[PDB]
Write a protein that binds this ligand. Structure first.
Ligand SMILES: [Ca+2]
Ligand SMILES: [Ca+2]
Length: 117
């Protein structure tokens, strides 16, 4: 049952919206800098995962991906418009995308994931 949009409240790892799978974009909005948005996806077989989150508003945002044990495995790079990154998933399991805005009023976004998901 893959998601095409966030489902609030998703403001902690324990309420993360998902699963997110490749080929199905996921919409949402960072309501303001207090709105944390967490998502999850499931790695079934080891392999590369690529993440691109399109910024559809103004502001400074970023993401980090945590594995099931709360280790950071990937950090976004901002190109101005898109927040992107990739990592090698050596173990199957659930991964959590933590998306937040450190400066900005309101930010619609679109999440795309690719690879071993
Ligand atoms: Ca949100
Ligand atoms: Ca949220």
């Amino acid at each position: 049952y893959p998601i095409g949009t966030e489902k609030e409240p998703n403001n902690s790892k324990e309420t993360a919206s998902g699963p997110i799978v490749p080929g199905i974009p996921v919409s949402g909005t960072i309501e303001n800098t207090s709105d944390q948005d967490y998502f999850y996806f499931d790695v079934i077989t080891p392999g590369e995962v690529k993440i691109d989150i399109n910024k559809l508003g103004y502001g400074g945002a970023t993401w980090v991906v945590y594995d099931e044990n709360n280790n950071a495995v990937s950090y976004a790079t901002d190109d101005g418009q898109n927040l992107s990154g990739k990592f090698k998933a050596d173990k199957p399991g659930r991964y959590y995308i933590h998306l937040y805005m450190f400066n900005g009023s309101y930010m619609p976004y679109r999440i795309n994931i690719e690879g071993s998901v």
